[PDB]
Amino acid sequence: KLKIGITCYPVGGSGVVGTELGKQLAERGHEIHFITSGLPFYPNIYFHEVTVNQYSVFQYPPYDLALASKMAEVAQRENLDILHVHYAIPHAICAYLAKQMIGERIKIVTTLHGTDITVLGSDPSLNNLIRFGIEQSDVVTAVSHSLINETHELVKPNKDIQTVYNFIDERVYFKRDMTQLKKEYGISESEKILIHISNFRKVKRVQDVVQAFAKIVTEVDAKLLLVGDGPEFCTILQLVKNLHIEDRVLFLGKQDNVAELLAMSDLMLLLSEKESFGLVLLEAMACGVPCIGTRVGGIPEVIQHGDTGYLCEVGDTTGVADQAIQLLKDEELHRNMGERARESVYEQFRSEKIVSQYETIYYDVLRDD
Amino acid sequence: MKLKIGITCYPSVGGSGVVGTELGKQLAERGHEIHFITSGLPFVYPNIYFHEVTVNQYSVFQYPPYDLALASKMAEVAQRENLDILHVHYAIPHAICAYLAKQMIGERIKIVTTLHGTDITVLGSDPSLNNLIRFGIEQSDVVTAVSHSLINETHELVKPNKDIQTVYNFIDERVYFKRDMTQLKKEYGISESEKILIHISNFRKVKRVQDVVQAFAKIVTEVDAKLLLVGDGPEFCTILQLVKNLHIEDRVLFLGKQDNVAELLAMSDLMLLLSEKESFGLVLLEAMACGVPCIGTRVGGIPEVIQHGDTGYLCEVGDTTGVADQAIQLLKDEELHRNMGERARESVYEQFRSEKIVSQYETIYYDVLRDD
Ligand SMILES: O=c1ccn([C@@H]2O[C@H](COP(=O)(O)OP(=O)(O)O)[C@@H](O)[C@H]2O)c(=O)[nH]1
């Protein structure tokens, strides 16, 4: 009964997630309208270009005003009930305009993915905008509690936001037969490998990940995978170059296929100082990989110290070292944890369970009048 | 009863740019508090201050969120300072940003949109942005346009529910005056004694620069002229070619981008503007301000500035011959020219006088802070 309009990015952290939601809302019956800037991914979905080719005195390609317009068009001709948007900064203020232009004939559901706050909401040049985007939405949701917390103190909106966690594509992440092409990486020695797929910035504290591999490899014949190329590349490329080994810590480069070399992995590391939700942590667990993450932001909402993984202080290389060498020694516990970690995913991060929350929201917002 | 105003405009290179910046200065010079909230620093005084909208600190952003940044700063600046008026100039990124910023600050502020040509005549026809412009306009307290011509078009394309007022552009009178350029006239090898035709203006295809040189080929057969082309862009190359095929390479000077338009005008005899669509274009008013008589095509709001009778000459678009004849006619009769030029300078200090037009925006500002 519900005509729904999803809007997300063709960030890979904001889109794909809002996509799978639309992908699977069409399967429950709903009419789904993808209003978006890119062409990236069904009998119940239609796309909308959102052309940006309008530039003369084009210093600034008017993408926002063009976006807020396509929303107004698609919602006035196809007559939408809801306008769901992801990532607050670009497409929430955009959504407010369309509603305003089409005469309050629509309800809005904003969904705060982490990055739109912990990175942007730090400079006040734009802070009062996020606030107004949020406050003005009909319903607001966040993919974490640590994210709901940051918002209420960084931005301090007069609105109140509920939690809906991010599901992963449980159809792309699973235990894989990853020993055959695994050998082509020179890595079939019964090595016991460790992976790290961060973003690449200095906030992700990779200087530790390498620093810890050094301290742990002295007691385990282990190999490292540094997935993700960015600003810190040069610095880390040295940290191994001079610190003892590059024979066992090859930077795999930024790969589009992380999932495959995840199943291959035996334990991932994430020692960032600041993260709202870890999408790759699920992506790790979802295919049976135990992991060590730092007690930081929204990490203890994905990791339960215990059977799923471990939580260690932000910045403790010698301390992180332990929990790795300890686990790589034992065989049973390592396999035990690798399965319960896989399980906790499909227990509280179920693709159908999360979509279920969204749908109940969609209906509950439309309901009073 | 003085006033705190918030003026916004583009860096430079268009009508909107200089027209805001000047009205900022003029108003400051009258005791009003003039906060500039812009993309950067437009072309140091004692009375306004500037609020650059830093577009920096952004990652994994599809594009530099200027629009949203402008709105954020606009609304922030209107509070810290408590502006009584937000005066937005070229409409397209600004009138939405302003409206947006008004809504952010409890609607304490009053908003004024000032439609200059381009945002209506081309963006208005764009189905992606049309709907928005309409909303941008309607949602503003007072909307003014640079000519009556621009108002009609705004009603034909954008079709807003708002009445829009008329307030022409203006010009710092102190900047343009007959001057003599004996030194610069030599560096360009224009030492043959007289007859410099000027066309300072845009490069876009709508500017009909084609016709500007075509007519100049038909002109140059007879008076020993030199065309001074100023500004570069899309058609720039295309035009650079056309002159070649005409053998007039050694008479046409492609000055391209220029900052001191005052100097170049002060050595010019006859300005041409042959736009197929134009909405005013000061370049006419800037010329007339120093004596230089203009020949423009009869479109848009050109008839509002050039009085066909005495201050210049209007001829239908594409009539390259038509311009040329009127051009040679005028340049030949040395008595008629000096009288025409002197009358053009009159019309400017009378109809488009700076103290006047400024006083109009000022008296607009006041009449929208009463009854609220
Ligand atoms: O090379 C140039 C091009 C333009 N301008 C200035 O830009 C303004 C308007 O030019 P444009 O055609 O770009 O805008 P429009 O006249 O259409 O409003 C004039 O006042 C000029 O003083 C200039 O100084 N040098």
PDB file of all heavy atoms in Angstrom, chain A residues 19-36:
ATOM      1  N   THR A  19      20.372   0.841  -0.652  1.00  0.00           N
ATOM      2  CA  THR A  19      20.046   0.130  -1.883  1.00  0.00           C
ATOM      3  C   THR A  19      19.376  -1.199  -1.570  1.00  0.00           C
ATOM      4  O   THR A  19      18.276  -1.465  -2.051  1.00  0.00           O
ATOM      5  CB  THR A  19      21.302  -0.141  -2.735  1.00  0.00           C
ATOM      6  OG1 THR A  19      22.107   1.043  -2.804  1.00  0.00           O
ATOM      7  CG2 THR A  19      20.921  -0.592  -4.145  1.00  0.00           C
ATOM      8  N   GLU A  20      20.046  -2.024  -0.763  1.00  0.00           N
ATOM      9  CA  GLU A  20      19.533  -3.344  -0.380  1.00  0.00           C
ATOM     10  C   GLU A  20      18.180  -3.225   0.306  1.00  0.00           C
ATOM     11  O   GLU A  20      17.343  -4.121   0.203  1.00  0.00           O
ATOM     12  CB  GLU A  20      20.516  -4.085   0.540  1.00  0.00           C
ATOM     13  CG  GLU A  20      21.909  -4.367  -0.043  1.00  0.00           C
ATOM     14  CD  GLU A  20      21.909  -5.337  -1.222  1.00  0.00           C
ATOM     15  OE1 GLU A  20      21.351  -6.450  -1.096  1.00  0.00           O
ATOM     16  OE2 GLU A  20      22.480  -4.981  -2.275  1.00  0.00           O
ATOM     17  N   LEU A  21      17.982  -2.111   1.008  1.00  0.00           N
ATOM     18  CA  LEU A  21      16.702  -1.798   1.629  1.00  0.00           C
ATOM     19  C   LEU A  21      15.624  -1.628   0.561  1.00  0.00           C
ATOM     20  O   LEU A  21      14.518  -2.141   0.715  1.00  0.00           O
ATOM     21  CB  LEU A  21      16.810  -0.543   2.506  1.00  0.00           C
ATOM     22  CG  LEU A  21      15.546   0.019   3.176  1.00  0.00           C
ATOM     23  CD1 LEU A  21      14.820  -1.025   4.013  1.00  0.00           C
ATOM     24  CD2 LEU A  21      15.887   1.230   4.027  1.00  0.00           C
ATOM     25  N   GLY A  22      15.959  -0.921  -0.517  1.00  0.00           N
ATOM     26  CA  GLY A  22      15.045  -0.737  -1.647  1.00  0.00           C
ATOM     27  C   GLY A  22      14.889  -2.011  -2.457  1.00  0.00           C
ATOM     28  O   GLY A  22      13.784  -2.352  -2.890  1.00  0.00           O
ATOM     29  N   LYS A  23      16.008  -2.711  -2.653  1.00  0.00           N
ATOM     30  CA  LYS A  23      16.042  -4.020  -3.311  1.00  0.00           C
ATOM     31  C   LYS A  23      15.066  -5.003  -2.650  1.00  0.00           C
ATOM     32  O   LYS A  23      14.372  -5.757  -3.337  1.00  0.00           O
ATOM     33  CB  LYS A  23      17.481  -4.573  -3.296  1.00  0.00           C
ATOM     34  CG  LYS A  23      17.685  -5.968  -3.908  1.00  0.00           C
ATOM     35  CD  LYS A  23      19.086  -6.508  -3.596  1.00  0.00           C
ATOM     36  CE  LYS A  23      19.253  -7.986  -3.967  1.00  0.00           C
ATOM     37  NZ  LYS A  23      18.414  -8.914  -3.153  1.00  0.00           N
ATOM     38  N   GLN A  24      15.000  -4.963  -1.320  1.00  0.00           N
ATOM     39  CA  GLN A  24      14.197  -5.913  -0.547  1.00  0.00           C
ATOM     40  C   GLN A  24      12.825  -5.380  -0.108  1.00  0.00           C
ATOM     41  O   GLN A  24      11.998  -6.134   0.413  1.00  0.00           O
ATOM     42  CB  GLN A  24      14.997  -6.434   0.653  1.00  0.00           C
ATOM     43  CG  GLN A  24      16.246  -7.216   0.249  1.00  0.00           C
ATOM     44  CD  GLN A  24      16.948  -7.883   1.416  1.00  0.00           C
ATOM     45  OE1 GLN A  24      16.389  -8.017   2.507  1.00  0.00           O
ATOM     46  NE2 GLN A  24      18.182  -8.317   1.186  1.00  0.00           N
ATOM     47  N   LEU A  25      12.586  -4.088  -0.319  1.00  0.00           N
ATOM     48  CA  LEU A  25      11.263  -3.512  -0.076  1.00  0.00           C
ATOM     49  C   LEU A  25      10.343  -3.767  -1.265  1.00  0.00           C
ATOM     50  O   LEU A  25       9.124  -3.871  -1.107  1.00  0.00           O
ATOM     51  CB  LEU A  25      11.344  -2.011   0.229  1.00  0.00           C
ATOM     52  CG  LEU A  25      11.533  -1.536   1.679  1.00  0.00           C
ATOM     53  CD1 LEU A  25      11.985  -0.084   1.701  1.00  0.00           C
ATOM     54  CD2 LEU A  25      10.279  -1.716   2.532  1.00  0.00           C
ATOM     55  N   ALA A  26      10.937  -3.868  -2.450  1.00  0.00           N
ATOM     56  CA  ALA A  26      10.202  -4.217  -3.658  1.00  0.00           C
ATOM     57  C   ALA A  26       9.716  -5.668  -3.594  1.00  0.00           C
ATOM     58  O   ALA A  26       8.701  -6.015  -4.203  1.00  0.00           O
ATOM     59  CB  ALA A  26      11.070  -3.992  -4.882  1.00  0.00           C
ATOM     60  N   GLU A  27      10.441  -6.501  -2.840  1.00  0.00           N
ATOM     61  CA  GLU A  27      10.102  -7.916  -2.648  1.00  0.00           C
ATOM     62  C   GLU A  27       8.951  -8.130  -1.651  1.00  0.00           C
ATOM     63  O   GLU A  27       8.285  -9.168  -1.684  1.00  0.00           O
ATOM     64  CB  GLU A  27      11.343  -8.713  -2.220  1.00  0.00           C
ATOM     65  CG  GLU A  27      12.402  -8.898  -3.326  1.00  0.00           C
ATOM     66  CD  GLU A  27      13.733  -9.475  -2.821  1.00  0.00           C
ATOM     67  OE1 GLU A  27      13.809  -9.906  -1.650  1.00  0.00           O
ATOM     68  OE2 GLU A  27      14.712  -9.498  -3.603  1.00  0.00           O
ATOM     69  N   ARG A  28       8.725  -7.150  -0.774  1.00  0.00           N
ATOM     70  CA  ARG A  28       7.602  -7.176   0.177  1.00  0.00           C
ATOM     71  C   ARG A  28       6.338  -6.520  -0.393  1.00  0.00           C
ATOM     72  O   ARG A  28       5.306  -6.473   0.278  1.00  0.00           O
ATOM     73  CB  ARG A  28       7.987  -6.520   1.513  1.00  0.00           C
ATOM     74  CG  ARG A  28       9.176  -7.168   2.216  1.00  0.00           C
ATOM     75  CD  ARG A  28       9.200  -6.837   3.701  1.00  0.00           C
ATOM     76  NE  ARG A  28      10.447  -7.271   4.337  1.00  0.00           N
ATOM     77  CZ  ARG A  28      10.671  -7.290   5.653  1.00  0.00           C
ATOM     78  NH1 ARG A  28       9.732  -6.905   6.513  1.00  0.00           N
ATOM     79  NH2 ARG A  28      11.847  -7.704   6.113  1.00  0.00           N
ATOM     80  N   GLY A  29       6.432  -6.011  -1.621  1.00  0.00           N
ATOM     81  CA  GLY A  29       5.274  -5.485  -2.344  1.00  0.00           C
ATOM     82  C   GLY A  29       5.339  -4.023  -2.749  1.00  0.00           C
ATOM     83  O   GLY A  29       4.809  -3.644  -3.794  1.00  0.00           O
ATOM     84  N   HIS A  30       5.997  -3.212  -1.922  1.00  0.00           N
ATOM     85  CA  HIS A  30       6.013  -1.749  -2.064  1.00  0.00           C
ATOM     86  C   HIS A  30       6.507  -1.255  -3.429  1.00  0.00           C
ATOM     87  O   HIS A  30       7.237  -1.958  -4.132  1.00  0.00           O
ATOM     88  CB  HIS A  30       6.869  -1.105  -0.962  1.00  0.00           C
ATOM     89  CG  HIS A  30       6.451  -1.461   0.434  1.00  0.00           C
ATOM     90  ND1 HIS A  30       5.317  -0.950   1.026  1.00  0.00           N
ATOM     91  CD2 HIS A  30       7.035  -2.254   1.362  1.00  0.00           C
ATOM     92  CE1 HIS A  30       5.211  -1.425   2.254  1.00  0.00           C
ATOM     93  NE2 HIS A  30       6.242  -2.218   2.484  1.00  0.00           N
ATOM     94  N   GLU A  31       6.093  -0.041  -3.790  1.00  0.00           N
ATOM     95  CA  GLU A  31       6.581   0.631  -4.989  1.00  0.00           C
ATOM     96  C   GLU A  31       7.775   1.498  -4.607  1.00  0.00           C
ATOM     97  O   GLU A  31       7.653   2.412  -3.787  1.00  0.00           O
ATOM     98  CB  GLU A  31       5.474   1.491  -5.609  1.00  0.00           C
ATOM     99  CG  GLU A  31       5.786   2.021  -7.008  1.00  0.00           C
ATOM    100  CD  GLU A  31       4.783   3.064  -7.490  1.00  0.00           C
ATOM    101  OE1 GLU A  31       4.424   3.970  -6.709  1.00  0.00           O
ATOM    102  OE2 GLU A  31       4.361   2.986  -8.663  1.00  0.00           O
ATOM    103  N   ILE A  32       8.930   1.203  -5.197  1.00  0.00           N
ATOM    104  CA  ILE A  32      10.173   1.879  -4.823  1.00  0.00           C
ATOM    105  C   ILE A  32      10.709   2.787  -5.931  1.00  0.00           C
ATOM    106  O   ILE A  32      10.900   2.363  -7.073  1.00  0.00           O
ATOM    107  CB  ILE A  32      11.270   0.876  -4.373  1.00  0.00           C
ATOM    108  CG1 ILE A  32      10.718  -0.119  -3.341  1.00  0.00           C
ATOM    109  CG2 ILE A  32      12.496   1.613  -3.833  1.00  0.00           C
ATOM    110  CD1 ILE A  32      10.110   0.518  -2.095  1.00  0.00           C
ATOM    111  N   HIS A  33      10.941   4.043  -5.568  1.00  0.00           N
ATOM    112  CA  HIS A  33      11.484   5.036  -6.475  1.00  0.00           C
ATOM    113  C   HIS A  33      12.868   5.444  -5.995  1.00  0.00           C
ATOM    114  O   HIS A  33      13.023   6.044  -4.926  1.00  0.00           O
ATOM    115  CB  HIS A  33      10.552   6.245  -6.554  1.00  0.00           C
ATOM    116  CG  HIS A  33       9.288   5.982  -7.310  1.00  0.00           C
ATOM    117  ND1 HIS A  33       8.904   6.731  -8.401  1.00  0.00           N
ATOM    118  CD2 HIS A  33       8.327   5.043  -7.144  1.00  0.00           C
ATOM    119  CE1 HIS A  33       7.759   6.269  -8.871  1.00  0.00           C
ATOM    120  NE2 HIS A  33       7.386   5.245  -8.125  1.00  0.00           N
ATOM    121  N   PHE A  34      13.877   5.085  -6.779  1.00  0.00           N
ATOM    122  CA  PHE A  34      15.244   5.467  -6.481  1.00  0.00           C
ATOM    123  C   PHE A  34      15.530   6.827  -7.097  1.00  0.00           C
ATOM    124  O   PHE A  34      15.669   6.951  -8.315  1.00  0.00           O
ATOM    125  CB  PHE A  34      16.223   4.418  -7.011  1.00  0.00           C
ATOM    126  CG  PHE A  34      16.301   3.173  -6.168  1.00  0.00           C
ATOM    127  CD1 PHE A  34      15.320   2.186  -6.256  1.00  0.00           C
ATOM    128  CD2 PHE A  34      17.362   2.982  -5.292  1.00  0.00           C
ATOM    129  CE1 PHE A  34      15.399   1.031  -5.478  1.00  0.00           C
ATOM    130  CE2 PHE A  34      17.447   1.833  -4.510  1.00  0.00           C
ATOM    131  CZ  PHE A  34      16.463   0.856  -4.604  1.00  0.00           C
ATOM    132  N   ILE A  35      15.577   7.852  -6.250  1.00  0.00           N
ATOM    133  CA  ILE A  35      15.992   9.185  -6.676  1.00  0.00           C
ATOM    134  C   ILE A  35      17.443   9.362  -6.261  1.00  0.00           C
ATOM    135  O   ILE A  35      17.741   9.466  -5.071  1.00  0.00           O
ATOM    136  CB  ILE A  35      15.138  10.299  -6.035  1.00  0.00           C
ATOM    137  CG1 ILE A  35      13.642  10.059  -6.290  1.00  0.00           C
ATOM    138  CG2 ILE A  35      15.592  11.672  -6.548  1.00  0.00           C
ATOM    139  CD1 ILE A  35      12.717  10.821  -5.347  1.00  0.00           C
ATOM    140  N   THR A  36      18.343   9.377  -7.239  1.00  0.00           N
ATOM    141  CA  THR A  36      19.770   9.383  -6.944  1.00  0.00           C
ATOM    142  C   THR A  36      20.628   9.947  -8.078  1.00  0.00           C
ATOM    143  O   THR A  36      20.208   9.979  -9.235  1.00  0.00           O
ATOM    144  CB  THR A  36      20.265   7.969  -6.521  1.00  0.00           C
ATOM    145  OG1 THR A  36      21.664   8.015  -6.213  1.00  0.00           O
ATOM    146  CG2 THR A  36      20.005   6.933  -7.618  1.00  0.00           C
TER     147      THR A  36
END
